[PDB]
Design a protein around this ligand. Sequence first.
Ligand SMILES: Nc1ncnc2c1ncn2[C@@H]1O[C@H](COP(=O)(O)OP(=O)(O)OP(=O)(O)O)[C@@H](O)[C@H]1O
Ligand SMILES: Nc1ncnc2c1ncn2[C@@H]1O[C@H](COP(=O)(O)OP(=O)(O)OP(=O)(O)O)[C@@H](O)[C@H]1O
Lengths: 713, 196, 98, 71
Amino acid sequence: QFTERALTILTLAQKLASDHQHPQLQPIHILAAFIETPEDGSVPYLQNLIEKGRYDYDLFKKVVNRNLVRIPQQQPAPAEITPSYALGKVLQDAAKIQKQQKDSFIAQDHILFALFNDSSIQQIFKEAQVDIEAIKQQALELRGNTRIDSRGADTNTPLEYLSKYAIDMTEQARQGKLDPVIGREEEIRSTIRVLARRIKSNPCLIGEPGIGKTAIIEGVAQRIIDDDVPTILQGAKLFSLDLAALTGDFEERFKGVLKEIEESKTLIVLFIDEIHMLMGNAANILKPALSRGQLKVIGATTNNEYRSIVEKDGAFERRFQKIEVAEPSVRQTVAILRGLQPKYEIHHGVRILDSALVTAAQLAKRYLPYRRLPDSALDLVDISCAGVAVARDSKPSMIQNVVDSDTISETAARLTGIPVKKLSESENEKLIHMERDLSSEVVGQMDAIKAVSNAVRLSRSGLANPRQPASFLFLGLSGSGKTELAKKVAGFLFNDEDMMIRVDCSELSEKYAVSKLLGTTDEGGFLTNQLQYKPYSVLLFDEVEKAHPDVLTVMLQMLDDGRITSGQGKTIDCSNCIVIMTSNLGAEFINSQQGSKIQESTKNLVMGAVRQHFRPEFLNRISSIVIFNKLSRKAIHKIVDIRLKEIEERFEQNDKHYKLNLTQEAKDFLAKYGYSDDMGARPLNRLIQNEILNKLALRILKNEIKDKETVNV
Amino acid sequence: QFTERALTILTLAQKLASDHQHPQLQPIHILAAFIETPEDGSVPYLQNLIEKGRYDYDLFKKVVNRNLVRIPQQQPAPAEITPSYALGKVLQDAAKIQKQQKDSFIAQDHILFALFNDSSIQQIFKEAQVDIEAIKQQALELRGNTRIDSRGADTNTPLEYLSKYAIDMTEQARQGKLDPVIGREEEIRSTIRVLA
Amino acid sequence: KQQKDSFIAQDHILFALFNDSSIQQIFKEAQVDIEAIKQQALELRGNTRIDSRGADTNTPLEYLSKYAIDMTEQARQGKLDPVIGREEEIRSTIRVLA
Amino acid sequence: DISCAGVAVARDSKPEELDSKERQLQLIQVEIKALERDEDADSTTKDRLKLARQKEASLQEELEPLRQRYN
Ligand SMILES: Nc1ncnc2c1ncn2[C@@H]1O[C@H](COP(=O)(O)OP(=O)(O)OP(=O)(O)O)[C@@H](O)[C@H]1O
Ligand SMILES: Nc1ncnc2c1ncn2[C@@H]1O[C@H](COP(=O)(O)OP(=O)(O)OP(=O)(O)O)[C@@H](O)[C@H]1O
């Protein structure tokens, strides 16, 4: 039976016979119904079955221009009020070729197919078109199996189906639309390598989003239109799915392409983005036909996405090769950064200095966890582009070239902040002065600090395995810098308080591999999240001495490789991560520091304890273990003052401008009552406000303090 | 007042009769002025309500200048000097469909519309402008919402009811109709930034 | 084509037989030309019977297709690969049917 | 088959070694471009432009003769 778009074809010739008020349904109505507009946009028109197959229709278009208009006048009601079986035998008569394309019901050409019998101007110059086979011929010769039922423009587009969802950038290549690619070359060649196998030509590309996985396809196709596509491969061209709404459940449409491209004679390729569809319920789609062994197909993913369906399946695996896409090098970035460098600055009507370009690639490489310098650099760039180009655009211009700095800096400032660190000194002088920097926090443990400052350089220069943590287990008490130190650490290192990340073993006696994010069975993402939020980071564990067989055993991986697996299966870099461990074990021996005990002696004395509490392997990834020992007034009162230093931070700083007085006795009193042997004046610290702030807040309440009015005890 | 878009053609139609310096403004003139070239950038060719309504202009592209070259030549000042109320009515006559099709000003269809009598090949073989037959037909095809207000853009379904689902505030902007938000450019700082 | 087929089956030959295979006379035993065959070919196969094989659908049948498929003919068609070495292995698998 | 590919790959198109040379060619040739584009005392024509033009002259030779094996 007819297509609904044949009905829509019918609609037009009728709508013609409606608007142009033809009193009956005649042979020649359906050409205007056929022709969309003078375009070949109708499968009947020019690229059509007709012109190329046997004779040009544009002629029989050019002439029927009148035939359309030679219809007589009507009055309002009667126009085309009849089905006109003279024409309307095609209601039955069109059933000729409907199935013979291996189909269901009648189509545009196919109703027309019976029209060469029915609808035609068969005359001295016979206007009847492609004659015996030629229609059916060209019905097959153009697409063919051109329609099924009612769905999609009846003999849509110049050809048939696909081309709606068929997307080819070899065009855009040969159209120049495509970005040149870099450095995925033999990677492509490996993808290319995928392609020869009678067993599996079908790749899958594992790796981070935004890495270029689709942009990969460029060079794929680019080298294809370069005819770096090899012999077998040359015949194919670019095609890949642009996921269409099915518009009940129309995957038949998406089934449509399948044999279509299958019939299409290997002229193209199939690439598939990411969800290679696992529906929660459509399940096998194309999969068996996909499993047939024709139908070249490309996969791409990152780990867990790959881990989604195929782990069930394995047939994808059975039907594919998975191929990791390595996050490209910074210079891979830097290089292909320059690729659209001219572009985006011209996109943004500006100029660039590679100075920034590398600089972001330098800097930003660390600082966007989620997105990828494989893009984010550029993403910074467009970002870098605009606002300054905006500072050009409506008015805020002479700056056209990207500044190095602000384009990173200000944007980094836009991105995060505290440029001054991110501004100049990179990787290095921080180190030399790190200790003397860190010497701020609490004196003593300086060696450890040095060792830290050492180990962080062990953490650098890649001498120590660039895949490996920085392994730090600390001894002391509350107040002692397991208490503290991390605060400085990333604040020094990552310039943050929160790259420091809190973990308590007391929480974890048994199963926390459960809440580590186990394999979903209810989402334990925390640890993962902790990095998955925060990749360049500092890892504080608490009660580490009580670390239980569970938590410690992943500590091993944490100890290992500078990488962290998940329960969902993702592994996650620990290398750029810093690990921090509360250990109070030798608290005895720590307490013995009353004797100001020979450290190593008491360390050795301690060691056995910790040596007991931990298998060596643990101990033997540990990059150091140190006490946080006895405190000197020298230390103390300064450390005291340290908070006293920063009192202002909101107060005299971001609020009050309060002009500070302290009596040294009080400054000592601080130590005096306040310093706790075991816990320090860290308890008094909590107290401080009481004896300090409220004491002032009192005056604040009073107003005996006006700004700078200050009286203390 | 006439539609600018219409008047854009109209004065260009006055310009049309000026280039060959026609003696008079007469029905078959703007049949050339309606069309820069067959591009739907000139709608009167294909996108015209007639090619879809009645008379396709493809080969009917042929005859328009054929007349305006065969007009008796004139000199500059008498060119576009006259409405020639035979044509000069189209000024007013364009206001006839604005009622049947429900419009207010005089638009590209209307300037076109009025012409539907003699602007043509009117003969035994008449390649011409049907009177109500092409437009009221296809002035719904085109558009369907003829009213464009006192100030408006192309009056032929600009994006298919683009102003009937989304207000333009740049109206009210250009119209100055909303209290400009404040401390908001740093937001905008994002926006424009967000854009490019 | 209206039987929606690449090949011409035993319903299709009879389909043409609807004229000279008939008694079309004063008392007409014709053969129903279009109406009855089609929808009863909509009963019996469909496009489902593309064609290109041996032929099987006599009496109550004309199915064993779609999911039903065989590679034996395909092997006689040489559609597939000569195996090795699982012979006596197959000898078992074979002898299982016994 | 993968080997059969890898050969064909090489055999499929220009022998990796050829395209490897094609590759490294493409590497700096675009790099050297952007360098002098701006007024610089450091990244300008001084350093890498001289570096590349020799570095490009290093492996440029074998290509067409080793392509002449295909000829
Ligand atoms: N090698 C490359 N050559 C050219 N452009 C690239 C390259 N890598 C990335 N891009 C650019 O990155 C943008 C999109 O990145 P892309 O989507 O390819 O990353 P992705 O890992 O493929 O994420 P997706 O899942 O969408 O494929 C495009 O503008 C593209 O031009
Ligand atoms: N090494 C140190 N570096 C910086 N501040 C220190 C240090 N030692 C003591 N302090 C003081 O202690 C304050 C912070 O104490 P902190 O929050 O680190 O204790 P904690 O985090 O509760 O850990 P714990 O329970 O093991 O003591 C600082 O503001 C400072 O005044």
